[PDB]
């Protein structure tokens, strides 16, 4: 069978970038030695080790969505991936409010409207098992109390 | 954040509490009353219970 590949963003400090950056573009397997990601258990956090030096990692969600297009004449461009996830290397934390690009500042926050956005249902859930559990269940819409 | 308009715990600005009996190990019966402060869910949870009370 064939399995979509899964392409996500990594960003680095700067020095650290600059580093990685002359490593890719020199083409050497000796970059593959030098850059190793190493992905916790967590599945939200991790380390990035450029140079055999440790750097602290989170993989954060991102507000819009970005696609991988592919192009052979650069007229036609064919969609390879969906990226929505950044691993920035230095739950409320793992979103990331901000866009890649520079128009894209405080995206989530001002550009995105909030009739789309709004966790809850596995909350229903654990109530709903309860309750089956439970042999006598009391209800009342409260005031301030 | 960017300001918004805060809604109230709901229209009527009113909580959920549920009380849940159950029998411990060897013989107990114990109750707890637990208060869902979360508006929206609340509501989602009430709209369930009276859509189940017509599915009988």
Known sequence: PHELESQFILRLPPEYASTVRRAVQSGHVNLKDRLTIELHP????????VDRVPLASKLVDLPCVMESLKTIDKKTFYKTADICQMLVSTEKKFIWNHGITLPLKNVRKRRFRKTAKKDVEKEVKRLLSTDAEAVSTRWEIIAED | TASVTSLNSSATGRCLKIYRTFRDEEGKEYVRCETVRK????????????????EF
Do not use: F, N, S
């Not at chain 2, 508006?39 to 017509?54: L, N, Q, S």
């Open chain 1, 42 to 49: 967590d599945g939200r956090h991790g380390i990035v080790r």
């Open chain 2, 39 to 54: 508006p929206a869910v609340i509501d989602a949870y009430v709209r369930i219970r009276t859509t189940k009370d017509e």
